[PDB]
Design a protein around this ligand. Structure first.
Ligand SMILES: *[C@H]1O[C@H](CO)[C@@H](O)[C@H](O)[C@@H]1O
Ligand SMILES: [Cu+2]
Ligand SMILES: [Cu+2]
Lengths: 217, 217
């Protein structure tokens, strides 16, 4: 149970709560979204229609390292990913990211050792690189942790999400892919989402990361 | 989130919901006790004063195999124990087991190998032997699973509890010990209760079972 209220800007400053990140519904409860088919799986805003317009947009350069800071240690075992979408008409529009335009730029997978998965549950700041070749333009940047501590049953996986609003400058001519929709990216039946992390399947050879591969940009 | 509504009698019959097991407060929620100091940590009854009187008492013999069936798979990782107390004035008295009279008879313990804890989260029926040397008389039989999936913080451990009411016949001359009170047995600071199962401390040699040593009778 945690939120991602703070955008970490290119020079390493942790910005204010919900300044550049769309304030989420769980701003107080810290509870997860658990229905991957729901529209609110996209950015989980306090107000899906009003929150974007109350959120500022951060200017960055393609190639910059940026991040999020969680309100506590990211204490559930899971998979973490960061996905991006061009934001049309702009980063502060609620209609941004409603099409098949999302691509993955970063992930942190559990390790696999001795027939057991290995997790890091002590991280609070998550940082990563905005790809150098990413074209200039407005983008949504979505952090997602899939917490798997009770994921053995359908709808058991817990998703902790935040969407930052970006204005990306000094971009290249890359073509991000593969592309997915959110919701749409998951069914809930994926082997990395519906999973018993404590007693793994017989032919388990490593954590299968769900959704698109990381775009090499 | 599970309950232990069904007593498994000596012949292997899984008995009806709450017949010999005191109906618990989470009879619908399946939610856990989290305050080890609370009086209801004892048997977690729907009504601490009324439930015992509405619960039947199972006649068994010392040496018999008995147990509990949970209402689903016991799917959280943790530590399971079974404790007993002589029940005065009777097994159906709410006053039973209010003293320092509890002893451990059984456990299911997580394993430690290569720096990782190993759990079994697939069991639904828990069976065990009532020690052959146990003195004849009325007893409470308390099953407890300490779920550790979120136990890294104080009060994070989740306790799933059921108390069966027994009339033990054909007993022996054993003297059960060591003895504890419930509440009283735990403080919540035990290294087996206040614990990050995913990222274990430097000087961690193996899972330290909380509470008293198993009484081998
Ligand atoms: C703060 O530091 C960042 C990261 O090195 C730069 O991108 C930025 O121009 C400023 O100097
Ligand atoms: Cu949580
Ligand atoms: Cu539970």
């Amino acid at each position: 149970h945690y939120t991602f209220p703070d955008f970490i800007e290119p020079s390493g400053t942790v910005t204010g709560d919900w300044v550049y990140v769309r304030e989420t519904q769980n701003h107080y409860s810290n509870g997860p979204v658990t229905d991957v088919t729901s529209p609110e799986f996209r950015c989980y805003e306090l107000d899906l229609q009003n929150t974007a317009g109350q959120t500022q947009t951060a200017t960055v350069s393609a190639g910059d390292t940026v991040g999020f800071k969680a309100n506590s240690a990211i204490y559930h075992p899971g998979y973490l990913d960061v996905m991006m979408s061009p934001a049309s008409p702009a980063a502060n529009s609620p209609e941004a990211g409603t099409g098949q335009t999302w691509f993955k730029i970063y992930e942190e997978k559990p390790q696999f050792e001795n027939g057991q998965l290995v997790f890091d549950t002590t991280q609070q700041e998550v940082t990563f690189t905005i790809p150098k070749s990413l074209p200039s333009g407005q983008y949504l940047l979505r952090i997602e942790q899939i917490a798997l501590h009770v994921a053995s049953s359908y709808g058991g996986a817990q998703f902790y999400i935040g969407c930052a609003q970006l204005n990306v400058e000094n971009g290249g001519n890359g073509t991000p892919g593969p592309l997915v929709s959110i919701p749409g990216v998951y069914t809930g039946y994926e082997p990395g989402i519906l999973i018993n992390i404590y007693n793994l399947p017989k032919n388990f050879t490593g954590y299968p990361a769900p959704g698109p591969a990381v775009w090499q940009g």
